[PDB]
Amino acid sequence: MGNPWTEYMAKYDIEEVHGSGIRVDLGEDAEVAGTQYRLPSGKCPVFGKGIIIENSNTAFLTPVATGNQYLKDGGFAFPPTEPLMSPMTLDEMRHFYKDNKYVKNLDELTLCSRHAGNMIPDNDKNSNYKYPAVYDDKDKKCHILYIAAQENDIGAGPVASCFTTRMSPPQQICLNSVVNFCFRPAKDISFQNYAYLSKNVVDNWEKVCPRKNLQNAKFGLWVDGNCEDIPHVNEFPAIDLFECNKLVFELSASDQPKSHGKGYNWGNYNTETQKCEIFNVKPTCLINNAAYIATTALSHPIEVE
């Protein structure tokens, strides 16, 4: 008795390896100056996730609107600071943290998450509040998100104008201007190179988190020596894998006002019938079926292993 798949399938136990929402990650609370704020806390990167702002062509990685000029407009990212903390290229990150012996042998995504986590909302220097970030794998650039909300208590953090570094010797960094609208998370083709990163992304995410989809494989449940099919699935039409991953993402665990990672996080994509079969039970084995690709809401929407 027992399940021979246990070790290989640990990557797909979303409740354990990720532990928070996927579509909307607001799995923790942090105090800043006596006030509690929700913020993202998932331990895995979410590949291909971005935010779409309604009634706008403004990209969500545009810095948040500052000042009070007519037509002021912006996105979710940190505005300019002195010195400039965001966006920061991978090379800039490696050089500015060159004196921190612990950043060596951090991978690109982890380094971005830790850079974002360096800034403390200045009102509470003992605060556990850490901003999320988006890493652009194309331009190799890290964007700190000033607004942690993802759909619209909704994750809008403190209205901080000044920040202190967790890294010593401490530096204080303030915004160069004052900070001053419906939106939703999504996997868009234009987001395919992005990774959405909470403060909790683990150093070894490459080994414990799902990234690529599994070809010629179908998620199943281990039942007395056989890999049975998932008992209850929701079937949708999907012209290709990207559309199926987009759908799984839309239905996945969401903390929008805590999921703790529970939701419709997995999909079996039938490349022959062009059907996406989405379910909300953790899979415990894989079925050898040439027509299928197995995907999760966390996974890159296109890449296969």
Residue numbers in the entry: 6 to 157, 174 to 201, 211 to 287, 293 to 340
The authors write:
The malaria merozoite protein apical membrane antigen 1 (AMA1) is critical for RBC invasion and is one of the most promising blood-stage vaccine candidates. AMA1 binds to RON2 through a surface exposed loop (RON2L) to anchor the parasite to the host cell membrane prior to internalization into a parasitophorous vacuole. Here, three single-component AMA1-RON2L immunogens were designed that retain the structure of the two-component AMA1-RON2L complex: one structure-based design (SBD1) and two insertion fusions. We determined the X-ray crystal structures of SBD1 and insertion fusion immunogens 2 and 3 to resolutions of 1.80 Å, 1.85 Å, and 2.10 Å, respectively.
Additionally, we created insertion fusion immunogens by inserting RON2L into an AMA1 loop proximal to the RON2L binding site. Insertion fusion immunogens 2 and 3 were constructed by replacing several amino acids in the DIf loop of AMA1 with RON2L and a flanking Gly/Ser linker. Immunogen 2 lacks amino acids 260-PRYCNKDESKRNS-272 of the DIf loop, including Cys263, consequently disrupting a disulfide bridge. The disordered DII loop was replaced with a Gly/Ser linker in both of these insertion fusion immunogens to prevent the potential displacement of the fused RON2L. In contrast, insertion fusion immunogens 2 and 3 retained the RON2L binding mode of the complex but displayed local distortions in loops near the vicinity of the insertion sites, resulting in Cα RMSDs of 0.381 over 232 C-alpha residues and 0.309 Å over 228 C-alpha residues, respectively. However, the IC50 values elicited by the insertion fusion immunogens 2 and 3 were 1.5-2-fold higher (i.e., less potent), and they were significantly different from that of the AMA1 DI-DII-RON2L complex (P < 0.005). Similar to AMA1 alone, the insertion fusion immunogens 2 and 3 produced potent strain-specific responses but were ineffective in inducing a broad immune response, possibly due to the insertion of RON2L in the DIf loop. This insertion results in a loss of strain-transcending functional activity, suggesting that either the local structural perturbations introduced by the insertion fusion disrupt strain-transcending epitopes or epitopes within the DIf loop contribute to protection breadth.
